[PDB]
Amino acid sequence: MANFFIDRPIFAWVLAILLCLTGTLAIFSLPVEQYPDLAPPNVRVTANYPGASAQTLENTVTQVIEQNMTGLDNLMYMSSQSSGTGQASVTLSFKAGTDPDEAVQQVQNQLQSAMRKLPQAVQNQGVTVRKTGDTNILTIAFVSTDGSMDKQDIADYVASNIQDPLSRVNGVGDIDAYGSQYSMRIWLDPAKLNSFQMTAKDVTDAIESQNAQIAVGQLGGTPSVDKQALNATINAQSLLQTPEQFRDITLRVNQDGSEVRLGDVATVEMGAEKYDYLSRFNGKPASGLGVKLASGANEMATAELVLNRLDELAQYFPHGLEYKVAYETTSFVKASIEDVVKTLLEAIALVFLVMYLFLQNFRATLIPTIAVPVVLMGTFSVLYAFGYSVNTLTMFAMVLAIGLLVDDAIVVVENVERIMSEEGLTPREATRKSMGQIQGALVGIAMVLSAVFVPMAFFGGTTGAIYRQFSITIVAAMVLSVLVAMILTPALCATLLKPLKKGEHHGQKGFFAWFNQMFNRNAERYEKGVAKILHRSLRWIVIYVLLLGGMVFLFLRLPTSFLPLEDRGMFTTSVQLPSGSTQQQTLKVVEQIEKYYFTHEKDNIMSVFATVGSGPGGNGQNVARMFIRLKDWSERDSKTGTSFAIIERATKAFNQIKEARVIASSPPAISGLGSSAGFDMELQDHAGAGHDALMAARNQLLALAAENPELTRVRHNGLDDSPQLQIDIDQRKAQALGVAIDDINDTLQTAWGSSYVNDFMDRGRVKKVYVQAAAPYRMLPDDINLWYVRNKDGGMVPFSAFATSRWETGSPRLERYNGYSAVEIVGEAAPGVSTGTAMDIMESLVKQLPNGFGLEWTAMSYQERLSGAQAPALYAISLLVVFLCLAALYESWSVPFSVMLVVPLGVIGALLATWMRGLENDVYFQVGLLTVIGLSAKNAILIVEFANEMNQKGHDLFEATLHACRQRLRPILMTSLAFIFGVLPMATSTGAGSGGQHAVGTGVMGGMISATILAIYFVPLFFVLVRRRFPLKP
Amino acid sequence: MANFFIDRPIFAWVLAILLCLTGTLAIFSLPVEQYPDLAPPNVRVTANYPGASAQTLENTVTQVIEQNMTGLDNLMYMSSQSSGTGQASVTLSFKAGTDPDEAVQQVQNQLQSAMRKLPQAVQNQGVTVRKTGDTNILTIAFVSTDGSMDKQDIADYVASNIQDPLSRVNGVGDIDAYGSQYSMRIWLDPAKLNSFQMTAKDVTDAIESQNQSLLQTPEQFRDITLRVNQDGSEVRLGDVATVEMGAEKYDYLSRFNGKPASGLGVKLASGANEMATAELVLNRLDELAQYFPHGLEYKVAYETTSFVKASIEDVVKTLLEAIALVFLVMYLFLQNFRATLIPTIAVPVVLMGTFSVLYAFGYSVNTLTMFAMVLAIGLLVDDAIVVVENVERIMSEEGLTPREATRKSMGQIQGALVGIAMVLSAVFVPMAFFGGTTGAIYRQFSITIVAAMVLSVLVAMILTPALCATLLKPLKKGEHHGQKGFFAWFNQMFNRNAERYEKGVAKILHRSLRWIVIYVLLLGGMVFLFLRLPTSFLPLEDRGMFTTSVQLPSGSTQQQTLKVVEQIEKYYFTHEKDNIMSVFATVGSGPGGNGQNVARMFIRLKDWSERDSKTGTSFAIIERATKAFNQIKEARVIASSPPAISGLGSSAGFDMELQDHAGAGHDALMAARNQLLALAAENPELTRVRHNGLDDSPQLQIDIDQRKAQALGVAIDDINDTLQTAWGSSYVNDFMDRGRVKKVYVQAAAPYRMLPDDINLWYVRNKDGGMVPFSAFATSRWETGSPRLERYNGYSAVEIVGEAAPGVSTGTAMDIMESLVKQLPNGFGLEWTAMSYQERLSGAQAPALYAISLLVVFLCLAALYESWSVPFSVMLVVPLGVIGALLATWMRGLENDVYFQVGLLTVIGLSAKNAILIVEFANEMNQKGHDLFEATLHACRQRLRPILMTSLAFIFGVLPMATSTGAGSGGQHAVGTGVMGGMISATILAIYFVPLFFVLVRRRFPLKP
C-alpha cells in the first residue's frame, strides 16, 4: 500500500485534494451553534381549572396527571406546579437522546386515559401537551426616542405591527410580549346590573349579538332572473369600532321606550391590561418582546432572521420609535467560535515551528504540515456526513486532534530523515525502508489514540452527548491521519524531500547547530540514565509506587464540576419583594438597582432592561426581572470587568439591601438544561407532612445556606404564601336552584377575572373585547352576593346562594416534584468553590433539617451527579478496550501490560496541572484524561514495539531496549512537543469561552509533559521487567 | 482480464445474454411517465369557517395556522388563500425529495397545538391535512345526444352513478364535480307569505319538523301543511311557495362544443402512476357507460396520457433511428459488415444493462431517462469502436490473425478505454448531488449515463474482444479492399485528407504563437456567447391542449360570463376550426377563484399529424388567440398552455408573489397590483400578464339598529335566520330520491332576491306574534370587499403570473418583472414561486456545477495518468467544445435551460474523450523516449480515424433528436442541438489544438528522464 503511492504521488495528491474539497463544501454547509442539544427533552402538560384554589387544583388535576404519566418510556423525572390562578402544569423531562415527538405521542396517549378522571370543567377547558422549548433567543426593547409615544402606545404598536410578523419567522416557537395592545375593555358595575335586573350573562349575550359579522347569502344568487346586473355578497351587520358604539348597546327596551344602554350599566375603555408589565430600558419607559427558540432549530440562524425582519419593520416605524437588543446570545457564540478558530490556527503555527525546530529542512517540516488541512477537512466532511455541527465541543476536539493527527506524519518524516542521514539512501529508497520499518508503529499509534474515544460515545445523557462530539471528531481525525500517513506522507517524503543529506549541507553555524549539540549531549545522557535505571530497578519501582499514591491522592483531592461557566457578557438579576407588595414598590427597588448599575458599573454595563411585575396573568406584582448586557469582552477589563466579578460585587451590594430579595445570577451553561447557573435542588417532603412544615424547612435551609460562606446567592425558585380567594361552588346546591353550571362558571370568570367575548375592528386591525368587573369588585368574599345568575326559569339567583368565598392564606404556586410536595432551591458556589463541593454542603444542610425532608438534584445538578458517577466506569472501560486492542495487535499479553503501566505517568501530570491551575474535575477534564491515556499509550508504544521486534529477532533484551530508546527518543520528543505546543494556545486563551479552552487544555498539556518526562525512563523499566518475568519462547 | 475472455468467448456470451435477459425483464416492469417526481411535495391544510367574511377568516383562522406551521422541516415556502365563501386553505410546499408522508405527519402533529386556538365553529367543521394532488389527469364531459336530459339531469346521474364508482378507482385522489345532485328546491314567495301572514321562519320550522319515512315527489312537499286555520282550512307549502327538484348547488354551468353538459375533474393520488390511473378510470367509465340512459354519453375534454404516450413513442423512434445512423457511420468507416456489427452488438447489451440498473434503483421510463439513453447510444459505442478500429488497423498493417490482433490491441489501448470511461462518467457524478427539481432532472441523466458508461467499458473489455477474435474474418484483405466504387473513393479521400491534416498539424506546431491568439479569441467568444445567451428552465411542448380563462369585472352575473364564453366558443369554432377537436367551458370556475364572473375553458386540439406544423402549432394558435382576445374589452380573457411540470405550477410562464412588506394594507396592495399590471401590459416583452386571483367585489351590507329591533320585540337571531333563508339558502331536511338520500333547501324565489330593496319584502315574527316588516329595522348599504385574500410567506400578497413574448425567454421576462416591481411604490416586493423559483435556483447553481465537474474530471485524469501535464493538456480543449455548443444553441434559437446544462456537461466529456484519445498515445510514446514532435504526430496520425468515427457516431446519433418533429420535439431539440454543435466544434478544433496544448505543456515541463 505504501509503495503503491510512493510510486504514484499524483494519486495521493488527488486523494488529498478530494478530501480538501469535500471538507470545504462541508464547512460552508454545516450549521454553527454553541452546544449541540445537550438538554433532555421536556414535555409539558398544561391544564386549567377556573376559580380553583391551588390545593384543590393540585389534588384534583395535578396528582391525577402525575399518577397517569408514571410509566412513560425513558422518563427521567416529573416536575409539576399548581398555581392559584387556576392553571396547572406538569413538566415531564425525558432521558437525553430521546426523540421529542415520540415522548409527546406517549404523553398524549396516557393523557387520553387520564382526561376522563379529571374534573369535567378541566376537560371542557382543555389539556395541552407540547414540547417545552423555552429558550429565549433575544429580548428586544422598543423605546420612544422623542418621548412622544407613550408606553401603552408603544406596547400597542408593538403587539399590533411587530409581534405578528416576528412570530412567523422560522424557528420562532413563541414570542412573549412585555406589553399588551389596546382592547375594548368593559368594566361591569354589579350595582348597576342589579339595579336594572340584568346579569353579566345578558351583557355578554348582547355584546355577542350586536357586535358580529354574518354573511347571509348573495344579492343575485345563481338561480338568477333573466337579465340582472349585480352579484354581491350580503353581510348581516358589521363590527363596532369606536367605544361610543359599545356604550350604545341596547341590552333591553322597556315598554315605556326607555333603553338600558351598556354605558348606563357599565364603563367601556379602549385601554390595556390592568397589571401589564412595567418594562423599562436604561431608565426609560419601553416595551419588550421575548423571542423563544422553537424546538430543534438553529439559534444563530433564527436570531439572524428575526433581527433582519425587525430591521425591515423598523424601516416603517413611527417617528421616534426604535428597537434595542436588550439580550442576545449569538454574540458570544460568534466570539467563542472565532476565538477557537484563532486558537486552532495558532496551534497549527506552533506545531509547524516545533517541527521545523526538530527538522531543519523546510520541506521536511512542510510534509507533516500538509497533513493538517487534509485531515482537518476530512474530519469536517465526516462531521457533515453524520449530521454533526460546528460547535464549541467539535472545535475543541479538532484543536485536541491536531497534535495526535500530526503524530504519524511526524514519525514517518523523521524516520525517513534518520535513514537519509545515517544510511545515505535516496529519498525514495529511504521512504520505502521507513514505511517497511514503521508500518506497525503507525497502526499501533492510531489504534491507541482511537480506542480511548470509542467507549465514550456509548455513554448516555448530556455527558454522553458531549463525549460523542469529541469522539466522532477525534476518531475520524485519527483514522484519516493513519490513512494520510500511509498514502500522502510517503509520497511527499519520496518527492518533496531533496537529497540534501547526500549534499552534506548540514553543519551550518547558528542556533540550529547549538540545538543539535544540546540534543545529542542530552540523548547520550538519557541513554546512560536509562541504562542506570535498568540496573537499579528497585528504586524506580518504589518511585512508581509513590507516583501511584500521589495520583490517587490528587484524584480524591480534586474538586468536581460539570462545565465551566463563561462570561457571556450578560447576567440577570431577579427582584422579589415581600408578598403583597405593590408594583410601585417593586419599581422603586428596580430604580435603586438601576442607579447602582449606572454609577458603580458604568464602565461595563451596555444596557439594563427591567421588567417590573409578573404580567397581566401574574398573581403578584412583587417580582421583577432585569436583563443586563455588558460591554464587549474586549472593552471590559480582564481582571475586574469580568461578569463573575461584577456579579460578586453586585451580590455583596444587594445582600446589603434589606428591602427585598435581589439576586444577580449568570445565565446557565446549557440553555435548555436549567434556569440559572449553579446547583439545582428539589426539597422533597418524603414524610408527607403539611405544606407549612415544608415552608418552615425551606426557610431553615435558606438560613443555613446563608450561614455557610461556601454558598452564595442561595434562593427559593418560587413564591411565598399570600392570602388568596377560594371561590367554592356547590354544584348540587346550584342545580337544586336550577341554575346552569356553565352560566355560573362564566359569571365567575367575568367577575373574578376577565372574559373574552369577541373581536372588534380598530383602525382596520381586529382587537379583542374583554368584559371585566369594576375595579373595586373582584369577586371578594364580600361582594359575591352582588352577582346574580338567572336560572332556567329566569329568576336572578344570587351567586352567594350556591357559592362561598373566603380570604385564605396559602402558597399561590404549589410545586410537586416526583410525586412529593417540594420547593425548588437553587444557588451557586462561592468563588473558589466547585459546584460539587456546594452540592455536598447542601446535602449536609438538608441532613441537618428535620427528618422526613429529602433532596433530589434536578437538571444540571442531576446530570453532574450522573457524570461523576459514570466517570470511573468510563475510564475502566477505556483502559480495558485499549489493553485488548494492544493485545490483539501485538498478539501478546506482555507488551500491552508494559504499555498500560505508563498511564499513571500521564494521569499524575494532568492531575497536577489541573490542581495547580485551580481547575476542577469536570466533563472537559474527563475527556482530557482520556486523551492523556491515549497519548501515554502512544509514547510507550513508540519504544515497546521496536524493542519487542528486536527481541523477537533475537537481540539481547537490554541492548534491544537501549537501542529502541536511542532511536525513538527523537520521535517521542517531537510528537510530544507538537501536541504540547498545540494545546498551549488553549491553555493561554483570552476572551470568549476562555474558560472551556483552559479547562480542556491545561489538563492535557500537563499530562503530556509528565508523560514524556517520565515515560522516556519508565517504559524501558516496565518492558524489561515484564520480559524478564515472561521471556519469549525463543 | 481481456485475454481471459479472448480465450473463453462462451463465458462472455453468457454474460451478455444474462444482461440482455435482465434488461428485457426490466423493460416490461418499469413504470412509464412523462417526468419523474420533479415537483416539490405540497401539503394543504383546509379550514371551513361557515358564514365568515374573507378578512375575518384570514384574521381568525389562516394566520393562526400560518403561525403554528412555522418550524416545519425542509419547508420551502407557505401560501394561503382566505376565500369569502368561508373556506381557508394553507398550502405548504416542502423541499424537493422530502417524503410526502413524513411532511403530512409533521403537519398533522404541529396542527394539533393549533386546533384549540382556532374558533370553535372551525374546530367543529374540522380541519383536513392532505397531500396536494391538484393534477387534473382527466376531465370528462357528459352530454346528452338526444337532448332528453337537462344539465341537471346529466349532473345528477353523474353524481349518483358515476362520481362514487370512479372515486374508488385506484390512484384517484379526488374527483371534482362540475355539477350537483338534485335537491328539492323550495322557492318562497314574499307576496304569498304576507297574504297568509307567515314568515320564512314558519315555513323553515314546519319543513324541518315534517320528518325512511321521507317525502319522495315534489307534490308531497306542496301538500305539507304549514298551519291549520280555526275554520279547518289549512295553508299548504304549495300555497306559499313553488316546489321543484333543482340542484343543491347552482355554482357551475358547463358547456361542451356549445351544448349543455356536466363535467368531472379526476385528480391523481400522490405517488400513483398517471397513465395506469387514467387507463383504469376510462375503463371504469366505459363499464358504467353500459348502463347509461339513451342519449347520455361521456366525452374526454382533457387528457394527459395522449401526449405522454406520443412523446415516449417519438423518443423510442428517435432512439432506433440513432442506432441505425450509428451503424451506418460505423459501416462507412469499417467497410466489413462483421467489424461494424461487433460494436453494434454492444448497443443492445449496454441499453438493457442500463434498464436493469434503472429498475434496481427504482427509476422509471420517463422523457429524461430516454433522452439520457439516446445520448448514451452515441456515448457508449466509443470504447467498442476504439477496440474494433485498433484490431482492424493491426490486421491491416501487421497482418496478424484476429486472435493475435485482438490480444495486441487490448494491451495497446487498455489505458485509453479506462480514460474515456472516466471522463465520460466523472462529469455526470457531481451533477447528481445537486438538489431541487433541477437536481432531480440531473440525477435522472446521471444515473443513466454513468451506468451506461460503466457497462460500456465492461462490454469493451469483456464482450468485444471475444467478438473481434471470433467474428472477424482473418482474410481482412484477402481480395484487397474488394470495392472499387464508393468505398474506394471514400478511402482515397480519407487518406488524402489525413495526410493534409498531419501536414497542417506539423505547420501549426511550428507556428505556435498564431494559434494561441486564436485560442484566446475563442475563449473570449465563448464567454461572450455564454453571457449573451438567454436562460430558461424547460422548453414548452405542444401537448395538444391549452386553457383559456375568462374573468369579467367583479359583480358580473353568470349570464354575462356565459355571453363572453359563447363569444369565445364562436371564435374558436370559426377561426380555429381545423385545429380544435373540442372545447369544454365551465362558467363559475376559474384558476384565480370561483364566482359567477369567472369561467375556465378547456380546449383539446387535434392530433399532431392533422394540425399544421407551422400555423397549427399550439404556440401559434395561442398567440393568434391572444391577439384576438386582447380586443375583447368586456372581460379579461387569457389563453395559456399547460405548465411544463404538472405539479410545479398552475400554468406556463413565470409565477411571482407581489407581497406587501410594509403592511400598507389591502387597498395599497391592490393599487400596486393594478400599477404593475399596467406596466406589464405596456412592455412588449411580456404577454398574458394577469392577476391569479379575484378583484374586490361589491358587497351589500345590511344595517340593523338594535334599538328599533328590540322596541318591536324582534330577536336578532330571527332576523339573521330570515335573511339567511331568503338571500342565502337554508338546509331544512332530507328527502329520498330513487333510493338516494338528497338534501332539501328553502330559498326565496329569483324575482324576490334580485335587488337591494327586496329586503323590505320580508317580515319577522316578534315576541307577541305579530308581523314586523324588515323596512322598520333594517337599511341596506353598498360597500366593497375582497372575495379572496392571499398570503405568501406571511406577507399579504397577490399572485402575478404571465408568459414571455414569443422570441423571449422566461429569464428575460422575470428580469423585466423585477424591474417593474422596482418601479412600484416602496414597501412592495416580489418572491418567485412554483417553477419560477426552481428556475432561479438552477441558474444560481449552474456555475458551481460546471466548476465542480471540471475539477472532478481534471483530478480523475491526473490520478489515472499520474501526471499533472496530461489533464492540463486535456482540460484546455473543453472550451473548444463549449464554444460550439453555445454557437449551435444561439444559432437555432434555443436558450440556457436545464437541458443545455446537461448538454454542456456531455460536451465537456466528449472534448475530454478526444483530448484523451490523442494525449494518451502521445504521452506514452514520449515516456518511451520518442521525440515529442514525432510522438505527437504519430499519435495524431494513428488516432485520427478512431476519433473521427467515434465522433461521427455520436453526432449522427444525436442528429435525429436535433431534427425530430414528434410530440416532444421541443425537449429533443433542446437536448440534441447543443451537444451536436459542441461535438462538431470539439472534433474540428481539437484534432488541431490538442497537439498544440500537449506539445506546449511538455516543452514547458519536459519529462525529467
Author numbering:
A (entry chain B): 1 to 1034
B (entry chain A): 1 to 211, 237 to 1034
What do the study's own words say?
The Escherichia coli acriflavine resistance protein D (AcrD) is an efflux pump that belongs to the resistance-nodulation-cell division (RND) superfamily. Within the HAE-RND class of membrane proteins, AcrD is distinct in that it is a specific aminoglycoside efflux pump that mediates resistance to a variety of aminoglycoside drugs, including amikacin, gentamicin, neomycin, kanamycin, and tobramycin. The AcrD efflux pump is a substrate/proton antiporter. It works in conjunction with the AcrA periplasmic membrane fusion protein and the TolC outer membrane channel to eliminate aminoglycosides and minimize the toxicity of these drugs.
Surprisingly, our single-particle images also indicate that AcrD can assemble into a dimeric form. It is interesting to note that this dimeric oligomerization has not been previously identified among the HAE- and HME-RND families of transporters. The structure of dimeric AcrD depicts that these two AcrD protomers are nearly identical and display an “extrusion” conformational state. Superimposition of a protomer of dimeric AcrD to the “extrusion” protomer of trimeric AcrD indicates that these two protein molecules can be easily superimposed with an r.m.s.d. of 0.9 Å, suggesting that these two AcrD protomers depict a similar conformational state. In comparison with the overall structures of dimeric and trimeric AcrD, it appears that the assembly of dimeric AcrD is distinct in that the second subunit of AcrD is located at a position that is much closer to the first subunit, indicating that the dimer interface of dimeric AcrD is narrower than that of trimeric AcrD. Based on this unique structure, the dimeric AcrD structure may represent an intermediate that this pump must go through to progress into a trimeric assembly. Three-dimensional reconstitutions of these particles allowed us to obtain cryo-EM maps of trimeric, dimeric, and monomeric AcrD at nominal resolutions of 3.09 Å, 2.95 Å, and 7.66 Å, respectively.
